[PDB]
Amino acid sequence: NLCPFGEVFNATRFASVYAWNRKRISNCVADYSVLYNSASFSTFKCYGVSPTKLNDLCFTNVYADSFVIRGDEVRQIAPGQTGKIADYNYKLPDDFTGCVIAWNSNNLDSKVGGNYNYLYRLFRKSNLKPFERDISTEIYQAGSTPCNGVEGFNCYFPLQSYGFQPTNGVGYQPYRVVVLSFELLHAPATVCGP
Amino acid sequence: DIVMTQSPDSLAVSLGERATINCKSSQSVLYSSNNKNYLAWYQQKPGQPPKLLIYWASTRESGVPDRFSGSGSGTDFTLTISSLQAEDVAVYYCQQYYSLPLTFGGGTKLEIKRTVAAPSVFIFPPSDEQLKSGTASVVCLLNNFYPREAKVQWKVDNALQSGNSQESVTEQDSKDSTYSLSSTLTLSKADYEKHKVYACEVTHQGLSSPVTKSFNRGECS
Amino acid sequence: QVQLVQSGGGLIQPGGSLRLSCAASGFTVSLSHMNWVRQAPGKGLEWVSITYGDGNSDYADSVKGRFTISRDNSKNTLYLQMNSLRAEDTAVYYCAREYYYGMDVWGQGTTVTVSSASTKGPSVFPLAPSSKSTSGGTAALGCLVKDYFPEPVTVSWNSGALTSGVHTFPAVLQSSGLYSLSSVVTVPSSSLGTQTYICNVNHKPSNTKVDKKVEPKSC
Ligand SMILES: *[C@@H]1O[C@H](CO)[C@@H](O)[C@H](O)[C@H]1NC(C)=O
């Protein structure tokens, strides 16, 4: 009963970071060797576990979150980080136990003339809590005057696009991120190495 | 409308010294609820669009050197360059983004302060080629002077002329930080022929007394 | 990388119409607020219009009823349609994003000249050096570049070999509607008898090139 990580890492379509996807992985045997030994990743930072000893561990559940951000935003996908992605789009808790995996996806997610389908949240009345997902599209009041759900001066749509083009600098190129959460509860473990 | 007023219109600061520009709004741009001043500072150099320097009255845009800083609240704001660099010579604008219409200040020109330099003065009669065209241009040249303020008075047969001349001044020289000025007196050929003495009188801080350059029409000059 | 690239503009007669364009990359115009800002020659910045994500716009009083904003979402481009233009509308026109804390990214600017003057090459007249220059002192000479339209004019000296001490003044707009400028240079009085001085005037709008020798006059 192999854990279907291939559904997550090799999915054809990835979500925008503001509407990030989550797959709950239970009752299976995971082989993390196929990932950390893989050379396809530009980022593979783990927290609370040593990545090279992952197969010797056992967790209640494992969560795979995936989305697209741009290259210079990958550093924000870590505990304690700040910025519009970490504060308004995807937040990790301080006590995070898991791994953050990313790789350049310029060929899949950039388009001639720009790919404007990937969005991020630019405005919010408060920071996200850890693992919070906000898909609202309410007009944001940035100034003195209320907006009444319509765009006006200092009344902005809260989402913005990247516009990925293949010729972009690598820091502005799209990156696909998978965040594995290793959940340990007071319950029988259901996801283990081989 | 929220009227933005900058001061001074022009400021001369020695290289390495501190520059201070003031901006005042006719009404406050301080939002009570979030305690943010909706005020920005821009730096514009010739031929370029303005560049955001400071926003929220005091927050620096990414990439702006540390010597730039903003201060103030409500209706009175200030932009400070701690140690002036030659690259900071530009025009600076404030702007409120509190309410429509968006309004800028009149701008503050920042220039390098140097010692006083008196201008060398030259006067040029109209060419014979130009007089065949029916117009006569008389040019007075003030060369390599500081500061920029100067009085150029045209005199035709010792009568002071006003309303028939146009001035042009260069931007501050990058090497010696001086200015140069031209003033052009435009006359019909008929008017030019009806007078003899043409003089340009220059008053400037570097001159203990005004200097006059003159020529007589028809004589070698 | 947010970026704005402007296009269009140019010369137009009073009462004519021009269409300015502003193409964006790195962000979505229909998700942002966009300004047009103009700067008359030698003047400050004047806000023209703002266009929100839904396509609706607000305008300054000085242009309301004459300027209109349209948009092409697929081209991520904003257009400023200027009708019934007057000479007071002469300015460099910028597009700039209304970020929530200011105009953070600007287009490079588009010159708009509203005038009824005809395109015309300049007359070039010598500013001859005085014959009473100080022996051992400095003499001044130059070229008067008069009655051309439109901007700009460039003046080199001895095809570029003379640069030290050259001052080419900003043009002034005359009541004729035509421009005029002078370009001067200071040289040693010792050089007037041995060195030739020629100004090279270029006015490419009229495909004009003039070389004018400037020498001391005969008495
Ligand atoms: C993705 O597909 C390729 C197929 O060879 C390989 O890298 C791997 O089997 C897949 N990844 C995962 C996590 O299953």
Numbering used by the authors:
A (entry chain A): 334 to 527
B (entry chain L): 1 to 27, 27A, 27B, 27C, 27D, 27E, 27F, 28 to 215
C (entry chain H): 1 to 82, 82A, 82B, 82C, 83 to 216
What did the study's authors say about this model?
Here, we report the selection and characterization of three potent SARS‐CoV‐2 antibodies, S‐E6, S‐B8, and S‐D4, from a pre‐pandemic naïve human combinatorial antibody library established in 1999 that target the spike RBD and compete with human angiotensin‐converting enzyme 2 (hACE2) receptor. Compared to neutralizing antibodies from COVID‐19 patients with generally low somatic hypermutation (SHM), these three antibodies contain over 13–22 SHMs, many of which are involved in specific interactions in their crystal structures with SARS‐CoV‐2 spike receptor binding domain. To elucidate the molecular recognition of S‐B8 and S‐E6 for SARS‐CoV‐2 RBD, X‐ray structures of Fab+RBD complexes were determined to 2.25 and 2.70 Å, respectively. Fab S‐B8 and S‐E6 bind the receptor binding site (RBS) with different approach angles and sterically compete with ACE2 for RBD binding, consistent with the competition assay.
S‐B8 interacts mainly using its heavy chain, which contributes 73% of the buried surface area (BSA, 737 of 1010 Å2) and 12 of 16 polar contacts. IgBLAST analysis suggests S‐B8 is derived from IGHV3‐66, a germline that is highly similar to IGHV3‐53. In addition, two very distinct binding modes (A and B) are observed for IGHV3‐53/3‐66 antibodies depending on CDRH3 length. These particular germline‐encoded antibodies with short CDRH3 loops are more likely to bind SARS‐CoV‐2 RBD in mode A. However, in S‐B8, 32NY33 in CDRH1 is mutated to 32SH33 and 53SCGS56 (53TGGT56 in COVA2‐39, an IGHV3‐53 antibody derived from convalescent patient[ 6b ]) in CDRH2 to 53GDGN56. Intriguingly, CDRH1 and CDRH2, as well as FRH1 of S‐B8 still bind to a similar region on SARS‐CoV‐2 RBD to that of binding mode B.[ 28b ] The 32SH33 in S‐B8 is part of a type I beta‐turn. VH S32 side chain hydrogen bonds with RBD Q493 and the VH T28 carbonyl oxygen. The VH H33 imidazole forms a salt bridge with RBD E484 and a π–π interaction with Y489. The VH 53GD54 backbone in CDRH2 also forms two hydrogen bonds with E484, and VH T28 and L31 make four hydrogen bonds with Q493 and S494. F486 in the S‐RBD ridge region is buried in a hydrophobic pocket (VH W47, VH I50, VL Y91, VL L94, and VL L96) between the heavy and light chains, while 485GF486 and 476GS477 on the RBD ridge interact with VH Y52 and VL Y27d via π–π interactions. Of note, F486 is also buried in a pocket at the heavy‐light chain interface in COVA2‐39, which is also an IGHV3‐53 antibody, as well as other antibodies that bind in the RBS‐B mode. Altogether, 19 of 29 S‐B8 epitope residues are shared with 19 of 21 COVA2‐39 epitope residues, with 16 corresponding to ACE2 binding residues.
